[PDB]
């Protein structure tokens, strides 16, 4: 079972990653039988651990508690299709649930348990700062909606698509100029919305400067709190 499971798992991750657009006709028939076949190996593999390992030992391990949620969900999604009463919005959702099988591969990686203990220790050193970053990107989203606020009218036909005339559109658009990507075209619209280039009007550069300097200096400070947390483990 160090080698019987891999032929199944590597055969699963080729089943779930075939996925064309057209899939001529025979491929999409193989997608459903494979899922039907490879669950029949999944349950058995699980069920052999149910008897000859100990019941309390099996559920205590977190990685095999994960394998419980896999095998149950495979059965729930197959029978719900046979029930027939399911929206076409939902069968796409069930299909995305299988995709969680890719972590079955991660029963490997020998330092996996060292690795998660490295990462999850880091997040609880960031969850103070990361909640400051999200409340920073809200103030600048509530500000930009007041300054620009559907002044992107312009009487033209080109798509000034990162406008602020909504709450989510101003939450995409701030997070676009936060990560640096194409804040140039954005700033050239806030300048041209008010008074394009003039005296009073180009002082709306100041909105896209403080958003890009302060909005990165917060994000440069999540770079330290990791580095003081990732340095404590290096002492030992």
């Amino acid at each position: 079972f160090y080698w019987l499971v891999i032929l199944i798992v590597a055969l699963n991750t080729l089943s779930i990653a075939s996925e064309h657009h057209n899939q001529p006709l025979w491929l999409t028939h193989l997608q459903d039988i494979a899922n039907r076949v490879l669950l029949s190996l999944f349950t058995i593999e699980m069920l052999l651990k149910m008897y000859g390992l100990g019941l309390r030992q099996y559920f205590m391990s977190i990685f095999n508690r994960f394998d419980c949620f896999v095998v149950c969900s495979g059965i729930l999604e197959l029978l719900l299709v046979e029930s027939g009463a399911m929206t076409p919005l939902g069968i796409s959702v069930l299909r995305c649930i299988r995709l969680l099988r890719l972590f079955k591969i991660t029963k490997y990686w020998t330092s996996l348990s060292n690795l998660v203990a490295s990462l999850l220790n880091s997040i609880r050193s960031i969850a103070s700062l990361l909640l400051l970053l999200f409340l920073f990107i809200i103030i600048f989203a509530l500000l930009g909606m007041q300054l620009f606020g559907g002044r992107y009218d312009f009487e033209d036909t080109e798509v000034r698509r990162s406008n602020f005339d909504n709450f989510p559109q101003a939450l995409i658009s701030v997070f676009q100029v936060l990560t640096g990507e194409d804040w140039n075209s954005v700033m050239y619209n806030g300048i041209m919305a008010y008074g394009g280039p003039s005296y009073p009007g180009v002082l709306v550069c100041i909105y896209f400067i403080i958003l890009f300097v302060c909005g990165n200096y917060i994000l440069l400070n999540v770079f330290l709190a990791i580095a003081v947390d990732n340095l404590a483990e290096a002492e030992s």
Binding site: I16, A17, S18, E19, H20, H21, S92, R95, C96, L99, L102, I105, T106, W109, S111, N114, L115, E155, D156, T157, R161, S162, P168, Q169, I172, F175, Q176, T179, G180, E181, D182, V222, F223, I226
Partner: protein, 186 residues
């Protein structure tokens, strides 16, 4: 490497011996100065110190290239056949995005130009798991996601052109993943 670049530059003389294979052996002569780099000593300290660091970070790099496979397969699943846009944004399906239309210049309807129309396929589509690791590699490098992100918003059913601001809820994919990859790159 000295015996590899020399044997190919010699066979270009065998390839120039026929013309009187050609340009491939010309470009195998570029390796030369690499040999002069092994005659430099400063790098032995720098390159060696970095491969120390790869041994301990390898574990993270092997996980962050799993997410570009896992979010490829959820990315394929959710955007198959979308991003398939017709040239004049008014025709919405296969057969009828054909023939000639009007491109109005600047802004006013007195400057009609007549171009043809065809399906434009948006070049970084999510069709194959291989062809979705391409596109999700560029939004990983923070370059060109807005144009692509704002396309993933505008999409609807399988072979249909974009509707204007349909389903902004599919901007959560490009955010969580972008934020995650920003956390494993850091």
């Amino acid at each position: 490497n000295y015996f590899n670049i020399l044997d190919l530059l010699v066979v270009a003389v065998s390839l120039i011996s026929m013309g009187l294979v050609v340009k491939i052996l010309r470009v195998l002569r570029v390796l030369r100065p690499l040999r002069a780099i092994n005659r430099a000593k400063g790098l032995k300290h720098v390159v060696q110190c970095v491969f120390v660091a790869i041994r301990t970070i390898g574990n993270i790099v092997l996980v962050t290239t799993l997410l570009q496979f896992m979010f490829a397969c959820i990315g394929v699943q959710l955007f198959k056949g979308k991003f398939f846009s017709c040239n004049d944004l008014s025709k919405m399906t296969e057969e009828e995005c054909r023939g000639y239309y009007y491109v109005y210049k600047d802004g006013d309807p007195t400057q009609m130009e007549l171009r043809p129309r065809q399906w434009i396929h948006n070049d970084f589509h999510f069709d194959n798991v291989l062809s979705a690791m391409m596109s999700l590699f560029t939004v990983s490098t923070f370059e060109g996601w807005p144009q692509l992100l704002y396309r993933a918003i505008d999409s609807n059913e399988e072979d249909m052109g974009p509707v204007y601001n349909n389903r902004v809820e599919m901007a959560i994919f490009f955010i969580i993943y972008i934020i995650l990859i920003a956390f494993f790159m850091m």
